[PDB]
Amino acid sequence: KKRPEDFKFGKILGEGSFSTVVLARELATSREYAIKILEKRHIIKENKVPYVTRERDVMSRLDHPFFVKLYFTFQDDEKLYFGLSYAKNGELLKYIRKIGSFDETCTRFYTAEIVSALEYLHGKGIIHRDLKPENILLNEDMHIQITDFGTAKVLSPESKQARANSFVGTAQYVSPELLTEKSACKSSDLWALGCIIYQLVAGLPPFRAGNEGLIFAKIIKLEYDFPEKFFPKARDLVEKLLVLDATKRLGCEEMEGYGPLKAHPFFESVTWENLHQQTPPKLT
Numbered sequence: 277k278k279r280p281e282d283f284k285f286g287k288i289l290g291e292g293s294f295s296t297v298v299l300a301r302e303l304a305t306s307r308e309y310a311i312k313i314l315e316k317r318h319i320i321k322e323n324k325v326p327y328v329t330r331e332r333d334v335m336s337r338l339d340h341p342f343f344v345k346l347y348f349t350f351q352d353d354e355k356l357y358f359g360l361s362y363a364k365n366g367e368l369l370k371y372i373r374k375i376g377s378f379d380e381t382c383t384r385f386y387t388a389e390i391v392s393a394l395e396y397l398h399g400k401g402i403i404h405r406d407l408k409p410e411n412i413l414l415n416e417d418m419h420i421q422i423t424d425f426g427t428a429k430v431l432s433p434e435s436k437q438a439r440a441n442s443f444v445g446t447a448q449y450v451s452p453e454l455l456t457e458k459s460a461c462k463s464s465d466l467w468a469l470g471c472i473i474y475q476l477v478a479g480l481p482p483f484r485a486g487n488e489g490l491i492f493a494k495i496i497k498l499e500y501d502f503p504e505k506f507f508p509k510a511r512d513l514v515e516k517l518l519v520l521d522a523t524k525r526l527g528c529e530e531m532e533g534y535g536p537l538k539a540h541p542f543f544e545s546v547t548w549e550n551l552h553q554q555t556p557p558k559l560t
């Protein structure tokens with residue numbers, strides 16, 4: 277069982293409302309980790325214990341190359357520590373902001389990685405519920421590392437559960453069913469995927485406003501438009517994801533899952549096997 281003194285801490289990598297992520301080196305192994313550190317008094321006082329427990333439980337189930345890995349947890353009297361893989365290149369969002377708009381090859385490659393990751397997650401009966409570029413990190417090789425599982429949901433196989441009732445997410449990416457029916461499903465992540473693909477090409481997500489309520493109003497009306505130049509096959513894909521009826525989104529269980537989604541013409545040139553070993557295209 278590891279202890280804080282087993283590590284040398286370096287720079288702060290980021291701060292959440294209830295956490296601090298610090299780069300660390302484990303002394304006995306020289307391995308680098310991103311350690312997420314939570315102050316127990318704070319999580320207790322602010323009723324965050326279920327989210328911390330959820331993050332550990334969900335991440336403990338994942339072993340796929342496109343996710344941040346949870347290697348260990350420990351605690352001392354004041355803090356809880358999650359030892360995570362270090363995604364050296366940070367948030368996908370950073371690259372969208374700086375470049376403005378990904379070319380078609382880069383859009384296709386990163387979309388394909390996200391699709392592969394969602395296929396794995398949904399095959400385990402897990403809904404992410406907060407998929408967005410800030411939560412898609414990049415490792416040293418520029419492969420994706422999806423993170424932020426405190427708001428994810430393990431659907432129960434015993435009850436063949438399909439819907440989740442907690443109200444979580446981020447306004448720009450939240451699904452219409454969560455807003456109108458008050459539940460999410462695996463397909464809710466496919467709505468977020470559609471928003472992300474749109475954002476990679478257009479530079480901004482499709483439902484956008486300076487107030488969350490204004491965004492909700494547009495989501496539920498499917499009020500969005502495409503910029504005049506938008507890769508046609510990518511537009512077709514987005515139009516097959518941003519569908520109000522969650523049972524009609526390409527990739528969802530009612531549409532027979534990931535096979536038909538991976539068969540979409542936008543992905544004709546993708547080699548799905550060993551995608552995590554392919555050299556990503558350079559982002560320019």
Ligand SMILES: Nc1ncnc2c1ncn2[C@@H]1O[C@H](CO)[C@@H](O)[C@H]1O
Nearest residue numbers: 289290291292297310360361362363
């Ligand atoms: N495993 C990680 N590797 C690198 N940076 C991270 C990691 N986890 C979180 N962060 C950074 O810290 C912030 C707060 O969690 C994130 O938005 C991200 O920028």
Ligand SMILES: [Cl-]
Nearest residue numbers: 369370372373
């Ligand atoms: Cl930004």
